[PDB]
Design an enzyme around this catalytic site. Structure first.
Site, PDB file in Angstrom:
ATOM      1  N   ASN A  73       0.769   0.480  -4.568  1.00 51.31           N
ATOM      2  CA  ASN A  73      -0.927   0.096  -4.613  1.00 51.31           C
ATOM      3  C   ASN A  73      -1.431   1.190  -3.747  1.00 51.31           C
ATOM      4  OD1 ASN A  73      -3.355  -0.563  -4.254  1.00 51.31           O
ATOM      5  ND2 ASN A  73      -2.839  -2.630  -3.572  1.00 51.31           N
ATOM      6  N   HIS A 107      -5.940  -2.531 -12.632  1.00 48.49           N
ATOM      7  CA  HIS A 107      -5.472  -1.997 -11.151  1.00 48.49           C
ATOM      8  C   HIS A 107      -4.466  -3.066 -10.548  1.00 48.49           C
ATOM      9  CE1 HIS A 107      -5.486  -0.991  -7.112  1.00 48.49           C
ATOM     10  NE2 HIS A 107      -5.553  -2.213  -6.676  1.00 48.49           N
ATOM     11  N   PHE A 139       0.956  -1.371  -0.020  1.00 51.88           N
ATOM     12  CA  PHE A 139       0.043   0.074   0.005  1.00 51.88           C
ATOM     13  C   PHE A 139       0.894   1.328  -0.003  1.00 51.88           C
ATOM     14  CE2 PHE A 139      -3.163  -2.538   2.434  1.00 51.88           C
ATOM     15  CZ  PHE A 139      -3.774  -3.208   1.319  1.00 51.88           C
TER      16      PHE A 139
END
Lengths: 375, 375
Positions: free
Chosen positions: B322, B289, B201
């Site tokens: 991400n 994605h 992340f």
């Protein structure tokens, strides 16, 4: 054609609290009987609320099992989520099944789902849970409207209007489901504005089917959604805040909320109804979010509304309390039922044009123009 | 006409972490150097991530001032909210100003605003904050998309398509802003799936202007939004969950998540592209994605995609990690910029039709069909 409301239903948890008894119960269960002056302030708030009863999934048993929820600022978000995240879609399903029945079509014809709650966020969301609980098509197009508070009952109509009008044959299920699990807490003379919420907030869910181009062989329109606007009120910033914290959802009131809404509401009316040629606010039917009673009183005084214009809105507040986004949808349900029972000519108290108002943090006003249907 | 993307820009916090150095830094700042077995597993995860660097507003200084965030399950939601709720609209405004510049119109022409984040909920929301920070019209019609995770970059396009196509003259500002403030936490051998998130992340914001019926005197389309679908994958319940708790946002993963997405992706392609008469997945441009790198690899292998089909998606993953909903929008920006720089014939790598995929909790697949424009 225009987006049309084709069905409405509602649901509430079975436990209900009588407002006349609530100051005594609330100060007992929160172990705060020694705060005698605060109890008197809370009794006055409860009596001023014009609420007779409220439904709450939070029971005495549950509060005894979750004592950190009875403190003012106990670390309690986990306990609250554990209760609320299951309750939210469960109550929503109860309403949705009944709305689908009124609609009269098989649920496989639902193409879109809007779920709305401020009672607790999760990933995946309550939209996912409801989809699985109802057995909707896995390809249902979902929109999850989280944490938008008391204006979101109008927001979902604004959203549904564009979804259904832009997609031929689309049929949207809307579910709004709200509860007091995140906000219930013990009292404090630091945080008096929290007592307002403890006197007003309640549980409820409402479900609707919205679609354009009704099939008159099966479907029965209730209201047409003509327009939907949203505005922020000047100089109102910070008037209402809700913070998601370790102690749950905490509510903070800093300005004169009824004064702001009443001073600005006529601008929303003029913007919505000038294109229609209407300027007499007593000539349209009213659905107004009623969860702040002084808001309705001051809107009524400022505009010179007759006392009966807000009757349906105040009835829902009296019988159910401030169920946040669900209230305006309960009010539409009540209005059409009372119009049918009393022999009125339309689902809008015999009138043709109506307005639906959501009020909430921002300060935000959502303004939806409706048309009734004949009875 | 069809909804069209008229402008894109992005923003990231200035602090960045080099992935090759992250295992050592992460285990030191979380005071977890004694978890030697866990540190080697984390180094492998970072080595397999195919991320070179990530931007993060969480600095060493902030983590030392918020030690409960460095625990694994420290009571820390309040500290996280205090940081994230200001960062989210601030980074979003940075991207939005640049998108508005590219669009070329005054910001008074923005009629709608979609804000999307999973980095922290508040009432009023980030949509309200951005409206005030940018000085948008108070009557801007807002939609706040909270907590929908990594598929929501596609969700906002699906929403914007209906908003703009149903409202003549409307122009929607879309802002997605994500960060690691809610998820950063110390490691634990009871929660190994959390390590995946710590390896992947990152922070970022992207902003778009979307509208139908472009004014060719001022506006320049980049992509056309042809269709937008959403589906839940069969028997995937519980594969990805994110819980909002006293310790912040905690992430929970079953281990065959890439298999679920790769085994079902072709159904989404057939459903989206059969109306267009397209069956060759190498004949379209791709925005996928990229926040699960095994997802990209297994999709590529299952469909027989050329080695370069996912080039732009992998490049964003390499340079930014991400960033949840923002990734696919960074990927669109990267694709059009590289196509211009390299003399390609269209904004879609010289191809005419493309697919944009959002993947996230549900499991959910969002499928957007795009068309490029000539360069």
């Amino acid at each position: 054609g225009l987006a049309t409301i084709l069905a409405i239903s509602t649901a509430t948890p079975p436990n209900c609290v009588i407002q006349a008894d609530y100051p005594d119960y609330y100060f007992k269960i929160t172990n705060s009987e020694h705060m005698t002056e605060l109890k008197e302030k809370f009794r006055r708030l409860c009596e001023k609320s014009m609420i007779r009863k409220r439904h709450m999934c939070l029971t005495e048993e549950i509060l005894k099992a979750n004592p950190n929820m009875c403190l003012h600022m106990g670390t309690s978000l986990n306990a609250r989520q554990d209760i609320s995240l299951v309750e939210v879609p469960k109550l929503g399903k109860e309403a949705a099944t009944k709305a689908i029945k009124e609609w009269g079509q098989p649920k496989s014809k639902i193409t879109h789902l809007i779920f709305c709650t401020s009672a607790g966020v999760d990933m995946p969301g309550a939209d996912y849970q409801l989809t699985r609980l109802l057995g909707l098509s896995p390809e249902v197009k979902r929109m999850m409207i989280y944490q938008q508070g008391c204006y979101a009952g109008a927001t979902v109509l604004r959203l549904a209007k564009d979804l259904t009008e832009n997609n031929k044959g689309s049929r949207v299920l809307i579910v709004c489901s709200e509860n007091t699990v995140p906000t219930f807490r013990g009292p404090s003379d630091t945080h008096i504005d929290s007592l307002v919420g403890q006197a007003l907030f309640a549980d409820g869910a409402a479900a609707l089917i919205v679609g354009a181009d009704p099939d008159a062989s099966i479907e029965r329109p209730l209201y047409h959604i003509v327009s939907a606007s949203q505005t922020l009120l000047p100089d109102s910033d910070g008037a209402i805040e809700g913070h998601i914290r370790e102690a749950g959802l905490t509510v903070h009131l800093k300005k004169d909320v009824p004064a702001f809404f009443s001073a600005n509401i006529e601008k929303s009316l003029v913007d919505a109804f000038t294109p229609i040629g209407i300027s007499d606010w007593n000539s349209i039917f009213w659905i107004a979010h009623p969860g702040g009673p002084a808001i309705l009183d001051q809107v009524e005084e400022k505009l010179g509304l007759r006392k009966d214009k807000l009757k349906a809105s105040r009835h829902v507040m009296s019988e159910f309390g401030n169920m946040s986004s669900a209230c305006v949808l309960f009010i539409l349900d009540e209005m059409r039922k009372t119009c049918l029972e009393e022999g009125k000519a339309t689902t809008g108290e015999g009138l043709d044009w109506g307005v639906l108002f959501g009020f909430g943090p921002g300060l935000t006003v959502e303004t939806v123009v409706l048309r009734s249907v004949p009875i």
